[PDB]
C-alpha cells in the first residue's frame, strides 16, 4: 502492499533544494531523493550531509520538496524535527548547515 502516506515536519532553504536540482542536474536526474543521514562532524558542526538516491528505506519519512523528493532516517528524523537545514553553495559542492528555532 500500500501507499506510505507520511508528511515530516521540516524547512529547508532554497539553496538546499537548489543544490539536489543542480546536483541531480549535472547528474541528468530528474527526480533526486535527498536523503538525511546523521554524519559526525566536529567543531566545524555536527550537520548532516546530503547525496542523491533511487530507492526507498524500509519506511523512511519520504518528504516532498520543490519538485523533489526527500527521506529522512528514523533516526535522524528526530534529529531534524521540523529543523531547517540550510546548505551552502561553494568550490566543487559547497558545505552543512542546520539552525534550529
Known sequence: MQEQ?????????????????????????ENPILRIRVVP????????????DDTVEEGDHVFEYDGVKVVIDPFSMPYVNGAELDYVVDFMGGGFTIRNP
Open 5 to 29: 502516506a507520511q508528511q515530516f515536519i521540516f524547512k529547508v532553504t532554497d539553496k538546499a533544494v537548489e543544490e539536489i536540482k543542480k546536483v541531480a542536474q549535472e547528474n541528468n536526474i
Open 41 to 52: 562532524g566536529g567543531c566545524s558542526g555536527f550537520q548532516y550531509a546530503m547525496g542523491f
